[PDB]
């Protein structure tokens, strides 16, 4: 339950698992203006209703 990766500040991408470690890369809709802005910082995915927690 719930997955944990890092985003990379580049273009803002947080990376996790769906299936169980595919690497698969997701934006951060959640915070808009919190988005990910670091590189191999601190994200979780949670598509029980689709929000990650970037940075």
Same mark, same amino acid.
Do not use: L, M, W
């Given at each position: !339950? /719930?997955?944990?990766? /890092?985003?990379? #500040?580049? #273009?803002?991408?947080? /990376?996790? /698992? =769906?299936? !169980?470690?595919?690497?698969?890369?997701?934006?951060?809709?959640?915070?808009?203006?919190? #988005?990910?802005? #670091?590189? =191999?910082?601190?994200?979780?995915? +949670?598509?029980? =209703? =689709? !929000?990650? +927690?970037? +940075?």
């Amino acid at each position: !339950a /719930k997955y944990t990766g /890092k985003c990379t #500040k580049s #273009k803002n991408e947080c /990376k996790y /698992k =769906n299936d !169980a470690g595919k690497d698969t890369f997701i934006k951060c809709p959640k915070f808009d203006n919190k #988005k990910c802005t #670091k590189d =191999n910082n601190k994200c979780t995915v +949670d598509t029980y =209703n =689709n !929000a990650v +927690d970037c +940075d």
